[PDB]
């Protein structure tokens with residue numbers, strides 16, 4: 001299970017599910033037809049968000065690393 | 081008052097040796113240890129067995145050289161070897177010492193199953209540190 | 213926390229390798245391992261050869 | 265003591281050292297030059313050049329401390345001052361402009377003036393003469409007079425308070441009530457003086 | 473001097489006007505907004521400052537300005553965004569969250585403010601079982617207190633919103649579909665047994681009806697790390713309970729999810745009052761854990777730091793402007809420099825040090 | 830000749846406990862568990878009782894090897910406090926000195 | 931130092947050296963104290979500073 005793993009694997013994790021669910025709700029609000037799973041998780045926005053979560057889980061959590069995570073969230077969620 | 085290992089004052093006519101003059105609190109300060117083994121060092125075994133062997137070796141040497149010992153013997157253990165260093169008065173003839181050395185060494189090597197050697201330093205008479 | 217199947221099966225694989233008790237044994241039943249892994253008090257040289 | 269008698273008590277007054285050389289009395293000037301070839305005791309952990317450090321309040325804290333619990337005793341004193349400042353702010357805000365002038369909102373000045381109001385000039389020492397215990401009027405030193413004021417406060421609050429009240433709430437209510445010369449501690453001071461007046465005639469029976 | 477005293481107050485009582493120019497300035501919260509928006513949720517020591525000073529004033533700060541910016545640009549169509557205010561002890565996370573609660577309260581949002589969520593996982597003296605699910609438990613007193621405060625904050629919206637289903641409180645008492653949401657709240661207060669269930673209905677109703685565009689909904693949970701942690705409550709077998717088993721904790725965990733739209737979720741972390749956490753733990757993963765972190769991601773972490781040089785001077789002048797710093801040497805430059813060292817620019821330590829002085 | 834009749838009785842207790850150490854180990858192992866039927870455990874509870882009382886190792890007392898003193902003994906040297914002091918105060922113990930600090 | 935020393939009196943002891951010479955806010959100190967309790971560790975730092 002995920003708990004057993006010592007090194008976080010974003011693929012097929014709670015993060016990927018939570019991210020994919022948000023992106024699906026975001027595209028639905030846009031009124032676009034339901035998109036593919038691979039399409040939503042292939043964007044660069046999702047690529048960066050993967051790198052930041054992995055850093056927090058494996059490299060370590062700190063104010064510097066949390067700042068990088070903040071920027072990825074802003075790009076992923078289209079926040080100003 | 082403390083009575084332990086103290087040769088008490090007389091009226092200036094008692095000849096005490098260097099070992100006898102010093103009370104227990106001078107041990108490791110002015111006078112050393114008569115026995116030297118590794119059994120009382122930290123994390124070392126067989127203290128009980130080394131201490132019992134010493135008690136016997138001291139009573140044996142007194143009886144084997146009765147009236148011929150000027151001072152307490154010094155015991156030195158190195159590896160399995162035991163070394164007995166005794167100051168002995170020049171009372172007995174020379175050849176008698178050669179007999180008692182051969183006898184006491186052989187007997188103590190077959191009793192404790194270790195190599196035992198006897199080192200004898202002959203003095204003309206007991207050495208007096210001070211008159212107390 | 214609880215031990216998942218992966219966690220438990222790894223522990224048994226480890227105990228099997230390191231020669232430890234592999235089953236679930238109560239604290240009471242672990243004394244048998246101690247009794248047979250430790251020299252009894254009466255068999256120690258200090259006890260039977262206490263005296264000269 | 266681990267300090268030889270040659271050691272000197274440290275002087276932790278910041279302004280004293282930075283004063284111009286001419287501003288120092290020659291007696292003080294002499295001590296500085298002498299101290300250069302002497303040994304000085306290390307400063308205590310509670311001795312600092314802080315501008316907010318009051319010796320009297322620091323002493324009152326130590327007289328409340330139990331079993332070396334300085335954090336708790338300092339906390340109780342800090343909570344007390346706050347409890348007194350908050351009690352005067354309420355009265356000040358709820359008072360007219362004329363009344364507002366008199367009201368004092370500085371807790372450090374209410375504490376010092378309260379203690380001073382509880383200090384007894386004379387004392388009574390209990391002596392035995394002729395098979396009975398005859399106490400006699402005594403004149404108290406500055407140290408004994410100050411100790412008695414603090415001890416009487418820390419004892420009224422510790423004992424004569426409800427079970428559910430706390431020391432920061434009983435001590436605040438006593439410093440302020442003493443600050444107005446109406447508290448029970450002031451009564452204790454009146455009794456000590458009143459007893460001495462009764463025994464004024466029999467002061468003869470003192471040998472110390 | 474008193475140059476920062478001019479910077480120690482601002483006349484823009486309305487939180488919308490505030491901007492970077494207003495940084496390090498204390499804006500007074502109207503008296504009516506205290507007794508309506510903030511019947512709960514203000515820190516205990518801050519409430520003492522509001523009583524003695526006679527006025528509530530919240531310093532405008534960059535962390536709380538960043539948050540107000542995101543709330544203004546909220547895309548209601550998109551799923552709700554969780555803003556997590558994480559910082560060291562005493563840095564102002566609770567009061568930074570209260571600033572957002574004032575901004576939304578003035579724009580006619582529906583405030584769902586959980587003042588402290590640790591209070592629901594400890595020191596509970598009445599713990600009943602739930603009829604809805606027998607595995608779960610019900611905290612009657614904890615739910616009853618919240619409902620009374622939720623009623624006060626959202627009293628205006630309790631008549632407009634109306635239930636979309638029928639709720640059977642007892643055999644003899646039920647809520648007909650269409651009745652105002654105030655009825656659900658009223659029943660909970662009247663009958664304490666159903667209090668833990670009225671809350672669940674309220675959270676369920678608001679979450680569903682918000683998506684219809686009727687009203688906006690601010691889910692403000694301070695102490696959110698309590699939800700996915702450990703509890704100090706024991707069952708009749710004297711066995712410790714888990715957070716999920718509790719009914720209040722179970723319902724709230726749903727509201728902090730991004731599966732709805734029409735509002736914003738503002739979360740805050742607090743090691744103070746937390747169970748089984750170190751004294752020096754403030755980071756999100758340390759307090760939330762692996763379960764809590766995964767539950768809330770993707771979230772926006774907003775660091776609440778210590779007072780900067782401008783803010784520290786503004787805070788110092790505010791205390792002096794109210795005559796709080798009564799020590800003679802406090803107004804001096806050596807006093808201020810001393811308090812800056814002892815406090816270390818920490819908002820809470822400065823408040824504690826100045827309280828005694 | 831040993832110091833006294835008490836030291837002799839203890840010596841025999843130490844020599845009979847060494848003889849019955851394996852036996853009392855194997856039988857007592859059958860009782861210190863929860864894996865075997867209680868009927869067997871009750872029966873091993875009686876076989877252990879049937880062994881001679883001097884086989885029991887809790888009847889051994891550590892006595893001074895030179896004076897047979899029951900209490901006051903130091904286990905590293907097996908001597909009583911009184912006998913140990915005589916040897917220590919005379920420089921006859923290697924490395925033992927008085928403690929001044 | 932506010933985190934390591936949650937007690938006010940321990941922080942005051944670190945303030946004494948700098949406050950005395952009116953050098954507050956002019957130096958950056960990095961300390962390494964091992965051994966003793968909270969009060970003994972603050973005092974050890976004060977002399978070292």
Ligand SMILES: Nc1ncnc2c1ncn2[C@@H]1O[C@H](COP(=O)(O)OP(=O)(O)OP(=O)(O)O)[C@@H](O)[C@H]1O
Pocket residue numbers: 515517518521529530531532533559560561562563564565566567568741742743744819820823
């Ligand atoms: N914006 C502010 N305006 C006014 N006072 C403030 C502000 N921020 C912090 N303070 C002061 O700091 C104190 C502590 O703030 P607060 O309790 O909000 O911080 P916190 O980080 O949530 O604390 P904890 O970690 O204990 O939950 C307040 O009581 C107040 O005195």
Ligand SMILES: [Mg+2]
Pocket residue numbers: 515565566567742
């Ligand atoms: Mg808080």
Ligand SMILES: [Mg+2]
Pocket residue numbers: 887889890
């Ligand atoms: Mg015994």
